[PDB]
């Protein structure tokens, strides 16, 4: 990772946070190409001070996403890691966080968005599938909106797959169990589980989220329920909109080596 002097990055307003982060809008003044000077807009992630313990598993996590190079993957510019701060520096995207775009605009996200959504979701994990790299927290917050779709110019919605955060091999076991669904029931089990077929598991989660403009997954379930759910291996409802349905459940598969691999992921999402 490069490394990026605090001198040169200013923090401004706080965008939330996550597990053990907190996340801000920031600036970085930094000299690009051809020699000119720029002020970027920049996302920042800061690992909590009181959890500077989880640092490597903190970097490890998008170090990983950034020894390749994908358009639907989030660009890591560095990390600032000057004085007592673990900071993670990516590119600001505009529209932010999925999760939040599907509530503010569920009465004009059609299937037709949903499907264009998922065919580029379903692009990166092929792309991480093929290159045998686990990403381990797929979620709608973890999607980012680069692009709105525009009917007038026929453009696509445009996303990108954010970096994991700290993996699920090293959190806390009710973080995990707060998790489900997202987080596989083998992993539930043994967080030592962590493979390829998670990331099928968790993707079919994704899709759901997608279909139910915003919706959590068994948020009514508190983490004793859910450990429930897992046991009595429930499936997710199948959402209002059920164009998808099939898929979550063929993703949401119980038996890890069941689940389909992301080549046909896509060839079904294609026949839609
Ligand atoms: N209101 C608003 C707003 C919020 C965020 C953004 N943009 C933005 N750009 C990036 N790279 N982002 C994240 O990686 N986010 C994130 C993902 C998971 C966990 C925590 C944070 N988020 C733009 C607008």
């Given at each position: 990772?490069?490394?990026?002097?605090?001198?040169?990055?200013?923090?401004?307003?706080?965008?939330?946070?996550?597990?053990?982060?907190?996340?801000?809008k920031?600036?970085?003044?930094?000299?690009?190409?051809?020699?000119?000077?720029?002020?970027?807009?920049?996302?920042?992630?800061?690992?909590?001070?009181?959890?500077?313990?989880?640092?490597?598993?903190?970097?490890?996590?998008?170090?990983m996403?950034?020894?390749?190079?994908?358009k639907?993957?989030?660009?890591?510019?560095?990390?600032?890691?000057?004085?007592?701060?673990?900071?993670l520096?990516?590119?600001?995207?505009?529209?932010?966080?999925?999760?939040?775009?599907?509530?503010?605009?569920?009465?004009?996200?059609?299937?037709?968005?949903?499907?264009?959504?998922?065919?580029?979701?379903?692009?990166?994990?092929?792309?991480?599938?093929?290159?045998?790299?686990?990403?381990?927290?797929?979620?709608?917050?973890?999607?980012?909106?680069?692009?709105?779709?525009?009917?007038?110019?026929?453009?696509?919605?445009?996303?990108?797959?954010?970096?994991?955060?700290?993996?699920?091999?090293?959190?806390?076991?009710?973080?995990?169990?707060?998790?489900?669904?997202?987080?596989?029931?083998?992993?539930?089990?043994?967080?030592?589980?962590?493979?390829?077929?998670?990331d099928?598991?968790?993707?079919?989660?994704?899709?759901?989220?997608?279909?139910?403009?915003?919706?959590?997954?068994?948020?009514?379930?508190?983490?004793?329920?859910?450990?429930?759910?897992?046991?009595?291996?429930?499936?997710?409802?199948?959402?209002?909109?059920?164009?998808?349905?099939?898929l979550?459940?063929?993703?949401?598969?119980?038996?890890?080596?069941?689940?389909?691999?992301?080549?046909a992921?896509?060839?079904?999402?294609?026949?839609?």
């Amino acid at each position: 990772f490069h490394k990026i002097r605090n001198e040169d990055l200013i923090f401004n307003e706080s965008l939330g946070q996550g597990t053990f982060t907190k996340i801000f809008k920031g600036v970085r003044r930094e000299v690009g190409d051809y020699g000119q000077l720029h002020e970027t807009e920049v996302l920042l992630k800061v690992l909590d001070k009181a959890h500077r313990n989880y640092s490597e598993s903190f970097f490890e996590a998008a170090s990983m996403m950034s020894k390749l190079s994908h358009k639907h993957l989030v660009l890591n510019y560095g990390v600032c890691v000057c004085g007592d701060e673990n900071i993670l520096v990516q590119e600001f995207v505009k529209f932010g966080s999925l999760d939040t775009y599907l509530k503010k605009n569920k009465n004009c996200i059609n299937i037709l968005w949903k499907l264009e959504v998922a065919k580029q979701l379903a692009a990166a994990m092929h792309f991480l599938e093929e290159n045998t790299l686990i990403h381990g927290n797929v979620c709608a917050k973890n999607i980012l909106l680069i692009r709105e779709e525009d009917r007038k110019t026929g453009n696509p919605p445009f996303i990108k797959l954010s970096d994991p955060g700290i993996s699920i091999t090293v959190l806390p076991k009710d973080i995990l169990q707060e998790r489900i669904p997202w987080v596989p029931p083998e992993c539930i089990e043994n967080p030592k589980n962590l493979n390829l077929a998670t990331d099928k598991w968790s993707f079919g989660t994704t899709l759901w989220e997608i279909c139910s403009g915003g919706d959590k997954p068994l948020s009514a379930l508190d983490s004793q329920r859910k450990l429930q759910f897992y046991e009595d291996r429930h499936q997710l409802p199948a959402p209002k909109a059920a164009e998808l349905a099939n898929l979550i459940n063929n993703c949401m598969d119980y038996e890890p080596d069941h689940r389909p691999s992301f080549r046909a992921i896509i060839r079904d999402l294609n026949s839609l």
